[PDB]
């Protein structure tokens, strides 16, 4: 299974892997002041990093299926999309572009939220027509999508 990581960046099982240099997740980075759930209409801004915002502290953007979005999160997270829990799908009608995530295969993906609430990834580069949806979350943990 793709490892989870604790708020200090340490792997909780398995082997650590690096994130893709072009990901919107830039490590090392702090997080986990508070768990702060946000709506899709109130995703945090890069300028909210030092100050927080009116919703609370901010370490970036985190997402899991539901969809559920967070601007900070203290528990275990993915640093890479756990592709074993994704399934091939056609491109959806996208409502929002949320970041660039490393997959558990090491590759870079663009990540989107669909009109149907599904989280979808599409390969950024190389092989054509790769597109997957996040259909299982057996550890009920979010991906750290962006760091501020
Ligand atoms: Cl997994």
Numbering used by the authors: 21 to 168
From the paper:
Npro is a key effector protein of pestiviruses such as bovine viral diarrhea virus and abolishes host cell antiviral defense mechanisms. The nonstructural protein Npro (N-terminal protease) is the very first protein to be synthesized, releasing itself from the nascent polypeptide chain via a single, autoproteolytic cleavage event (Wiskerchen et al., 1991). Detached Npro is proteolytically inactive but acts as a viral immediate effector to modulate the host cell’s antiviral defenses (Ruggli et al., 2003).
It lacks 21 N-terminal amino acids and carries a C-terminal hexahistidine tag extension for purification purposes (Achmüller et al., 2007). This tag was autoproteolytically removed following in vitro folding from inclusion bodies (IBs), resulting in autoprocessed Δ(2–21)Npro. To elucidate the detailed mechanism of the single autoproteolytic cleavage, we determined the structures of Δ(2–21)Npro and Δ(2–21)Npro S169P6His to 1.5 Å and 2.0 Å resolution, respectively. Intriguingly, Cys69 was locked in a disulfide with the P1-residue Cys168, reflecting a ∼3 Å displacement of the Sγ from the position where it could attack the scissile peptide bond. We determined 1.25 Å and 1.5 Å crystal structures for solubly expressed and in-vitro-folded Npro, respectively. In neither case could we observe zinc binding at the TRASH motif but disulfide bridging between Cys112 and Cys134.
